[PDB]
């Protein structure tokens, strides 16, 4: 997809996931720009799970599958964000193993993506 289509997809993904949770605009907008530097609510952590389920990158137990994640990236991000996305997925392939609840597992994985992103990281 193109950069324009990707930026638009972020809003489409949030539009589908946000209604399921009680969330604050100011928390979602920090996630959007890669700022995972604040205390998440339980709702916000499960929100990241909802999003990652949509990508087919995690199971219901919040176990991240880097091979599958990598296989999904070709139709999820534009050419320009491929190397960054591959690098973050690879760096964070085992993050979920350090945590014990499915929502926490995915949230910490996404936080790790943002910490290992060499450029502008973005979350729906």
UniProtKB/Swiss-Prot annotation:
Location of the protein in the cell: Secreted
GO terms under biological process: courtship behavior; olfactory behavior; response to ethanol; response to pheromone; sensory perception of smell
Keyword terms, alphabetized: Behavior, Disulfide bond, Olfaction, Pheromone response, Pheromone-binding, Secreted, Sensory transduction, Signal, Transport
GO molecular function: dibutyl phthalate binding; diphenyl phthalate binding; odorant binding; pheromone binding
Residues binding 1-propanol: 52, 57
Tissue-specificity statement: Specifically expressed in chemosensory system in both males and females. Expressed in a subset of trichoid chemosensory sensilla located on the ventral-lateral surface of the third antennal segment. Secreted from non-neuronal support cells into the sensillum lymph that bathes the olfactory neurons within these sensilla.
Superkingdom of source: Eukaryota
Disulfide bonds: 17-50, 46-103, 92-112
Record-listed ethanol binding positions: 52, 57
Gene Ontology cellular-component annotations: extracellular region
Residues that hold butan-1-ol according to the record: 52, 57
Family assignment from sequence similarity: Belongs to the PBP/GOBP family.
Its biological purpose: Odorant-binding protein required for olfactory behavior and for activity of pheromone-sensitive neurons. Binds to alcohols and mediates avoidance behavior to high concentrations of alcohols, the alcohol-binding possibly resulting in activation of receptors on T2B neurons, the activation of these receptors inhibiting these neurons. Acts in concert with Snmp and lush to capture cVA molecules on the surface of Or67d expressing olfactory dendrites and facilitate their transfer to the odorant-receptor Orco complex. Required for cVA response, probably by binding to VA.
Protein name: General odorant-binding protein lush
Organism: Drosophila melanogaster (Fruit fly)
């Amino acid at each position: 997809m193109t950069m324009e289509q990707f930026l638009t997809s972020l809003d489409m993904i949030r539009s589908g996931c946000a209604p399921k949770f009680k969330l604050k605009t100011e928390d979602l907008d920090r996630l959007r720009v890669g700022d995972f530097n604040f205390p998440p609510s339980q709702d916000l952590m499960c929100y990241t799970k909802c999003v990652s389920l949509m990508a087919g990158a995690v199971n219901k137990k919040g176990e991240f599958n880097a091979p599958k994640a990598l296989a999904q990236l070709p139709h999820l991000v534009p050419p320009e964000m491929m190397e960054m996305s591959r690098k973050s997925v690879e760096a964070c392939r085992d993050t979920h193993k350090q945590f014990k609840e499915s929502c926490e597992r995915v949230y910490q994985t996404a936080k790790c993506f943002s910490e290992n992103a060499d450029g502008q990281f973005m979350w729906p």
